[PDB]
Design a protein around this nucleic acid. Structure first.
Lengths: 536, 83, 135
RNA sequence: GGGGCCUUAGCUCAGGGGAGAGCGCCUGCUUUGCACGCAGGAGGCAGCGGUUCGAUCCCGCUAGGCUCCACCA
RNA sequence: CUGGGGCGGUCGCCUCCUAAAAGGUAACGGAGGCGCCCAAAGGUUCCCUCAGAAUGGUUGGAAAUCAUUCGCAGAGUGUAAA
RNA sequence: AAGGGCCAUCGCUCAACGGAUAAAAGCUACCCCGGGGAUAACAGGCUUAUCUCCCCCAAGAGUCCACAUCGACGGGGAGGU
């Protein structure tokens, strides 16, 4: 996104405001992020800079996020040589993803001095540097970089500043001259000709189908500041750029300020992605446990198929006790009839009595019975766990962070893990009603028990796994009855499933019997389907 | 202290192993004298170094062991680069 | 295996079991008790053996009320060691007992059951005993 | 068994007035750029007791580990 | 010195128990401390009386400081114990 | 006058703290003398923690059944290898 084009746009459009901006205050809220509260054009404004590699940028934010309690070294060094400054001029560094502030300020003796603040936004190896005007000597540096990387340039203070090697790219037909359009995949190699390029921009321009026209038109657009700062969302993966989206299916939201675009982008992505990392790291573990339990019961089942001789021994003991008068002590076999009048030949111990033998058959029946009962109990345990984790994964798929924070504690309580009234969440409903729900099992149970009566109605899935939701004393019309089905089908084991039946039942028959093993009676069921955010 | 330890704490070289490796190659020197990883150092020392062809000359200002990141480079100063 | 949680001195002199008991000479918490006819030291393993014995014989029976607690520790040097070089390390815990002293009581249970249980306990104990009841 | 040393984040370290420095593995993100990164796995004084307003920091008891010794007939 | 020696540990002083109701009393018996500190932590004159608990009361919070009745003493007494 | 005496006072963990010198660690199986059963290795003796053996209560095992045979937690003795 942050191409040389976006850069150059910002260069002019911020000099629009901050000609000679008086740097009133300096702070460094986060590691690779710095705030200036500047006074320009008779107004105070915020100026965020970021060398944070993926989020490295520059911005002006209405959200002065948080000035730190600690003044760090870099912040204080900026205070030393820039505080109370004066932003004479801004420059674009020749359209590379780099910017320059030509700044003035009085030294410790009131003699006016100048400096060149450089902001190189390269991606993973962005940086912020401060330099002398005439000497070009570096004075400060955010990411000191020693030449063990055997690189062209160097960061360290005192040294003469140097810029990166500017590649051999014509920064602004010439592509049809230089590049052989037969090459294909030219969205790659427009980077090989132009300076300010994203593969996003290159692809969206190449998809306009010989297309020098698109390049020239868009370059004129940017040069004229004719762009439209919007954010694009191609099924998630929210992207943004000066130009709108060109072809893809993604949603678009437009803005008046690129600065507000950056605000509304990064203000979430700072932590949304962290929460996603946590969620996925947890989901992996949960799936490992559920998969493990499934394979465990597979082991138990395929083991069970080899010790199942119970009924034979039962029937044998029955027959022997029935025929305990024809039988010698010392015999090997017994031609015996079943009480269908087959004739079975039961083996014996030629040393034992028939009483002893029959009792041994009863003993073996007892034993096989016991072992099978054990295995069936273990099966029940494992299947309960598997269903618990399957519902859990459904919830985690249809989750919010507010419920994920509760789910973590639920599992730490279950001791699968290790390291207060907000329960429910609701939206609009039919009949101008409110329908509350909880993606967390614990919050759902809290709502079902403590937030409603017995005669109220609970609406959930009529199927394997889904959430639990209801309105406070849910006794509204069939409109609300069918509206609850949409909310049920949305947050279910199969979202967007157009054949999902919802079960509506009186809370008086809601079984509060692992956790969330809630059975139900006094129930009816209606085939329904998922819906949109209009379900809110 | 020792050269390799000094290089690691000053973050010239990221691994003491690599410091030892280069000193054993003898790519570097001190005060015009070829040196080794066990070579003693101190403030005021003038250090010649190589990175392939990139030759470097630096000056030693301080030395320690706790050496957090940005405070590392305070330990010394660049002087000159050749090739 | 009873234990005093905390103690001043982990090492004490042993002492002398002269005379009869001060108190605890008669059942008053329970009905049917046992008392001693000698003097000796008694250990947590002994008392818990007797306790679990009577409770297994009784299987739900009423209440017991042991009347002692092994406060005293007793040391024992390690094995195959010369004399001297400090006092030996503690080993366990001990209750000291005079004659005329009641050890275990019983209530909630008939006399025959009580007498049999206390017999069983006496055979786990070292000393001579007597069956007793409340006045 | 005896004596000495050690037992702090995943690893290595410092620090009687409130445990914080660096580094690494796996995963994820990430990108135009000459190995220049970021987030999470996670960051917790071996334990017990005592003195102090307080303890990693003083004392004592015990466990785990490393080294030394466990000889004369 | 040594319940043979060696290795270990200790070697002087203070407090308690052992110690057997004067005193004293051993052991490689049991527990702990000292190799100082205060120029006011001394002298004198005059003054008054503690710790904790329950009530009420911002920040004040279980626990500051507060008034409040109870309160031979549970506190303090430079430091170990008597 | 030097120097000494008297008075006051300083200098030592001389800590092995009534301090042998201002000044000092080890091997001896190549060893030697004087003495000791005042003191160790073998054996004897006393003890018997330990060891061996015997026994008590008896839960429990023993399909059932404490005691055919085993015998937990616990207890008491003998012997003197």
């Amino acid at each position: 996104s942050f191409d040389g084009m976006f850069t150059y746009g910002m260069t002019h459009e911020l000099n629009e405001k901050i000609m000679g901006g008086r740097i009133t205050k300096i702070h460094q809220p986060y590691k690779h992020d710095v705030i200036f509260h500047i006074r320009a054009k008779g107004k105070n404004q915020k100026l965020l800079l970021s060398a944070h590699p993926s989020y490295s940028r520059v911005h002006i934010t209405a959200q002065a996020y948080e000035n730190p309690s600690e003044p760090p070294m870099f912040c204080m060094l900026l205070r030393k040589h820039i505080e109370g400054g004066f932003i004479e001029k801004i420059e674009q560094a020749g359209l590379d993803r780099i910017m320059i502030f030509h700044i003035k300020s009085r030294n410790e003796i009131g003699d006016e001095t100048v400096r060149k603040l450089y902001v190189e936004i390269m991606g993973r190896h962005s940086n912020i540097i401060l330099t002398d005007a005439a000497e070009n000597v570096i004075i400060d540096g955010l990411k000191h970089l020693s030449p063990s990387m055997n690189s062209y340039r160097t960061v360290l203070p005192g040294q003469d500043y140097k810029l990166p090697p500017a590649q051999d790219k014509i920064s602004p037909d010439d592509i049809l001259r230089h590049l052989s359009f037969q090459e294909g995949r030219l969205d790659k190699q427009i980077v090989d000709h132009f300076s300010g390029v994203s593969p996003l921009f290159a692809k969206e321009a190449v998809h306009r189908a010989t297309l020098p026209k698109a390049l020239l038109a868009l370059f004129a657009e940017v040069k004229e500041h004719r762009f439209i700062p919007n954010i694009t969302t191609v099924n998630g993966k929210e992207y943004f750029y000066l130009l709108e989206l060109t072809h893809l299916k993604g949603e678009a939201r437009r803005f008046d300020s690129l600065s507000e675009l950056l605000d509304r982008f990064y203000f979430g992505k700072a932590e949304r992605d962290r929460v996603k990392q946590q969620a996925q790291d947890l989901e992996r573990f949960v799936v490992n446990e559920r998969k493990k339990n499934a394979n465990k019961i597979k082991k138990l089942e395929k083991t069970l198929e080899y010790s199942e001789n119970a009924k034979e021994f039962q029937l044998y003991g029955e027959l022997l006790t029935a025929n305990l008068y024809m039988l010698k002590k010392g015999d090997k076999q017994a031609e015996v009839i079943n009480y269908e009048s087959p004739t079975i030949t039961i083996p014996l111990n030629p040393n034992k009595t028939p009483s002893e033998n029959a009792q041994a058959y009863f003993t073996k029946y007892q034993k096989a019975k016991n072992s099978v009962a054990v295995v069936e109990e273990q099966i029940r345990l494992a299947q309960e766990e598997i269903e618990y984790f399957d519902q859990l994964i459904q919830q985690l798929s249809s989750a919010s962070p507010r419920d994920i924070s509760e789910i973590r504690e639920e599992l730490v309580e279950g001791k699968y893990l290790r390291p207060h009234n907000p329960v429910l969440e609701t939206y609009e409903s039919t009949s101008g009603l409110t329908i509350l729900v909880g993606k967390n099992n614990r919050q759902n149970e809290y709502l079902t028990t403590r937030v409603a009566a017995r005669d109220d109605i609970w609406l959930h899935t009529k199927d394997i796994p889904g959430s639990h939701v209801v309105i406070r004393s849910s006794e509204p019309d069939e409109q609300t009855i069918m509206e609850a089905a949409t909310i049920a089908a949305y947050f279910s084991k199969a979202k967007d499933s157009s054949s999902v039946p919802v079960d509506y039942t009186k809370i008086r028959h809601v079984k509060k019997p692992k956790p969330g093993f809630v059975t139900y009676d006094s129930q009816h069921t209606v085939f329904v389907t998922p819906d949109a955010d209009t379900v809110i | 202290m020792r050269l390799d330890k000094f290089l690691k704490v000053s973050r010239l070289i990221k691994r003491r192993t690599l410091a030892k490796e280069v000193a054993d190659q003898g790519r570097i020197s001190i005060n015009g004298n070829q040196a080794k990883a066990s070579s003693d150092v101190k403030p005021g020392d003038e250090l010649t170094v190589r990175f392939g062809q990139k030759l470097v000359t630096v000056q030693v200002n301080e030395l320690k062991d706790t050496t957090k990141k940005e405070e590392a480079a305070n330990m010394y100063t660049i002087l000159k680069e050749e090739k | 295996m009873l234990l005093p949680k905390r103690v001043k001195y982990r090492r004490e002199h042993r002492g002398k079991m002269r005379g009869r008991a001060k108190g605890g000479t008669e059942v008053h918490f329970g009905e049917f008790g046992i008392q001693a006819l000698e003097a000796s030291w008694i250990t947590n393993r002994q008392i818990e053996a007797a306790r679990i014995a009577m409770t297994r014989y009784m299987k739900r029976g009423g209440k017991v009320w042991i009347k002692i607690f092994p406060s005293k520790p007793y040391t024992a040097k390690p094995l195959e060691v010369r004399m001297g070089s400090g006092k030996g390390a503690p080993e366990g815990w001990v209750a000291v007992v005079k004659p005329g002293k009641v050890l275990f009581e019983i209530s909630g249970v008939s006399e025959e059951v009580a007498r049999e249980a206390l017999r069983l306990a006496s055979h786990k104990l070292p000393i001579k005993t007597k069956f007793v009841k409340r006045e």
